[model samples]
Each structure stands twice: as C-alpha cells, then as structure tokens.
Target: KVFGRCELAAAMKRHGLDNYRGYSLGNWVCAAKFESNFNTQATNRNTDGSTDYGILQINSRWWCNDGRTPGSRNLCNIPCSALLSSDITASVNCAKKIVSDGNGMNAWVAWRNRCKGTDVQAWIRGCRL
Candidate 1:
C-alpha cells in the first residue's frame, strides 16, 4: 500500500528491464501506465464492489480467496507486503500472462497513446532490467 512510484520504477528496472526479449515494450509500459498511472500505490473498486487492489491492481477475490480478511474487502484490500512485495518481477510475470493471453499491448495501448513519439520499446526496456 506504500509503494512509492519512484521506488516501484527502480524496482522494475532492476528486475524486469531485460526480462522481455521479444515482448513489446510499449505494450507493457502502456498497461502499467494505464493500470497505475505509474503509481505503485494505485487501487481500484469496481462499480459492483469488487476489490482489485495493489500496484498491479490484483483482484484479491481472484487470487487471495481468503474470505473477509484484512484485504478481503475492496477498500482495505491486501497490504503491499502481503501482495507481490519481494520482487517486481513477480508482478511483471502477472502482466506477462495478460500479454500472453493474446491481447498483446492493445489492452494498454490507450495509455501509450498519450506518450506518442516515444520509442515504446526503449522506454519500457529502460524501465526493465
């Protein structure tokens, strides 16, 4: 819950900068930018009251499955530590799953559109290991 954006960025660079070989850098950054606005402290509550929390906006209901715990609800959700805290790579892996799902970066293309002209690959690779 206390993920400093700068810290998150640094963490991403250290762990995932070079992880993606043939993956699209622009798409990854776009997903990240859209999901959290580059802010690791981001969280969201769906209109129907579902709790998608944490830096990656991981839906506790989707993975936690711990019924009514501290992060069981949308607002309080899980803390950063209880979430994917040890390494940023874990979070990227989750996103990688989303990418592998076949949507590619189109899911996140909306945000990348905002930073037009930037080398999507370079920028994203810069952020990764």
Candidate 2:
C-alpha cells in the first residue's frame, strides 16, 4: 500500500528509524520518497541481477537473500519477500543493518543524491512524532 506522507513518517518513527544511529527521521523519509514513493510493495531490478525491495528498497545483492542474486551476502538473513510486506518491520530492520554496516545512509543512492544534506526536515514537518 502507498502511505500518506505523515503516515510513512509515523511508521518509520514507530519502527525506530527516527534518530537511529545519528540519522534523523527526515533522512529516512526523504530517502523513502525517492526510493519507492512510499509504496510498501515496490521492487527494482538492477543490472547486476539483484533486486531492491519494499519502501526502503533493501537490496537482495547484500541485504536480503532472494536466492536469485548470484552471490548475495544476505546479511539481514531475511527473505527479500519480507521487505515487500506492508508490515515493514523487516525492511526497517535491514535498513538499520545497512547503516550499522558502516555505509551509513550513503548505501542508498537516492539518499545521497536526493536526500543527503537537502532540507531533509521538509519530509517530516507535518507529522506528529
């Protein structure tokens, strides 16, 4: 399902993305905007034979194991399909793992190009945290 702006904010905050690691909710919200347009079931197939899944676009190449990516590390140890669920728990958790893996939020191209250092707070202003 597609989420309203504030709805997505609330969900991310609820699942611990807010102030997670030193990244604010704004960063996450902005990244999600460009990554999947707030759609929980979003998926993108990459040229490298991996897929990005769910709202945060967790990748199968190294995060979730789709069993399709040639040599995915599967650091999250969760199925890629879990990232597509509306529940969002697995996706959010894996995003944290990405940040924890030393890439910070730069792991997502959308975040680096569209969200990083932009007026990120714009993505969460109307939302009640």
Candidate 3:
C-alpha cells in the first residue's frame, strides 16, 4: 500500500517530482490516480496476456520482468515485484526512464484515457505541494 492522493502529492514532491521529465507534479499525480489509485502493489492483466505493474502501471512488455511473460525487453531491468513495494525508488526510476524514452505520460494508458486534457488539480488539493 501507499499514500492517498494528497499524501502522494506531498511524497512525490519530496521525491523530487517538480518538473520531472518536463512534466508537472500534477501530471504525474493525475496519471497515478487513474493508473493505480496510489496503491503501490497494484497490478492488472492486459488483454494481450501482459501485466501492468505498480502505481504507474508500467507494462510488462517493456519495463519489468514478471516471469510469465516472454520476450519482454525488460528495459528497466527490475523485477515486477519491485514495483509492488512501498519503496517506490525502482518504480520512479523506471517511470522516469519511460518518460525520457519519449511519449511522455502517454506511455501510460490511464494518462491518455483519463488524465490527458483533464483538470487534475484535485489530486493535490490541500497538500500544499
């Protein structure tokens, strides 16, 4: 488990999310809310027999290894289980690399489907971050 939206906003700020990858903290939090609801251990099976991992729901086809999936690029070189922990260092690092690799937050389906062009200030309401 992890912090709620507000707490997550504060934590992410402390984690140095300010202008990360040329995206705002609001961008990350909004995407995270729709992605995993701030739950670090979140996972979802995709229709293509792949799984998404962690708060950002990174795809198994590219980022992390989950053992069941074959031919995964494993670009992050981390285990899927690592993304499921409260310690978000691995996940954050992976997400950073994902963003840097191009596509920005569009790498996350939730960001495209739910957060794009949406006002997500509510995710950080009252946190003062």
Write down the RMSD of all candidates, one decimal each: 6.1, 0.9, 1.3
User: Candidate 1 has which clashing residue pairs, if any?
Assistant: 16-128, 16-129, 17-128, 17-129, 18-129, 71-77
In candidate 3 the C-alpha lDDT for residue 51 amounts to: 96
Clash number for each model? 6, 0, 0
- For model 1, state the Cα shift of residue 103 in Å: 2.2
Best by TM-score: 2
Residue-level lDDT of model 3, residues 42-114, one tens digit each, is 9999888889998889889988989988777799999899999897778888988999886887888878898
TM-score of candidate 2 to 2 decimals:
0.96
Q: List the candidates' TM-scores in order.
A: 0.51, 0.96, 0.92
lDDT of all the models against the reference?
A: 0.49, 0.89, 0.84
| Global CA lDDT computed for model 3 | 0.84
Which wins on TM-score, candidate 1 or candidate 2?
Answer: 2
Q: Rank the candidates by TM-score, best first.
A: 2, 3, 1
